[PDB]
């Protein structure tokens, strides 16, 4: 039911600040020329990027390639993950390795610091399915959410 958000508050035109400091519509040519001008004048640590929660992989690698071409490596996300130890070197560090379907094979589930009902409703529905049909045992560490 959130799709109706796609019809509201949409960004439909490029905007740049005017002399009064206000965002104003402009052409693609003009908006990108301003961005390219600044990009050419900076290097390394002076350029950074932050990716939000809905960004796709094609955009993620395009932006990484562009910043790398000015020798920047400050490609950041908003969601933290500890980089201590192996960090993101090993995929198994940051994945749901058992898979979603694998929950139906588990005999004990330990939930830590999560409310899967609202963080991953369909994942939580798969836990309930195993709880109902496989007699799965679920333990939780954190607030006693329903």
């Amino acid at each position: 039911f959130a799709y109706d958000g796609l019809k509201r508050q949409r960004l439909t035109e490029p905007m740049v600040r005017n002399e009064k400091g206000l965002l104003t519509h402009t052409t693609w040519e003009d908006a990108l020329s301003r961005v390219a001008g600044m990009l050419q004048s900076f290097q390394g640590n002076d350029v950074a990027a932050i990716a939000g929660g809905l960004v796709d992989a094609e955009a993620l690698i395009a932006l990484k390639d562009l910043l790398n071409r000015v020798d920047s490596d400050t490609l950041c996300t908003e969601e933290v993950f500890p980089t201590a130890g192996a960090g993101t070197d090993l995929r198994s560090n940051y994945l749901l390795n058992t898979t979603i379907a694998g929950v139906e094979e588990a005999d004990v589930v330990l939930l830590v610091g999560t409310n899967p009902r609202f963080e991953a409703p369909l994942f939580n529905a798969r836990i309930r399915k195993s709880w109902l049909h496989n007699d799965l045992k679920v333990a939780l560490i954190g607030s006693p959410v329903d």
Binding site: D65, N68, R69, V70, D71, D73, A86, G87, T88, D89, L90, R91
Partner: protein
């Protein structure tokens, strides 16, 4: 001008990546301790020929094939990159 990132691609089961799998199992931890702030992105994918990607400054890249390499050749290819500065 030097190195920025290493990526190692391999298959989880194909024999051609057996030498790479041994290297990771036995050498990656030691290599990681020596280069603590260097990204060494290991990415396993089924039925890919193993490869070693090196990314240098300003987005220049080089790839060396590790197919049917022994764990020693993998070490050598790793050293050839950890001292190169393309």
């Amino acid at each position: 001008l030097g190195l920025r990132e290493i990526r190692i691609h391999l298959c989880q089961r194909s024999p051609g990546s057996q030498g790479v799998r041994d290297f990771i199992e036995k050498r990656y931890v030691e290599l990681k301790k020596a280069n603590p702030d260097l990204p060494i992105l290991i990415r396993e994918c089924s039925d890919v020929q193993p490869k070693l990607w090196a990314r240098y400054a300003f987005g220049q890249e080089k790839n060396v094939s590790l197919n049917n390499f022994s764990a020693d050749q993998v070490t050598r290819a790793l050293e050839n990159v950890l001292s190169s500065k393309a």
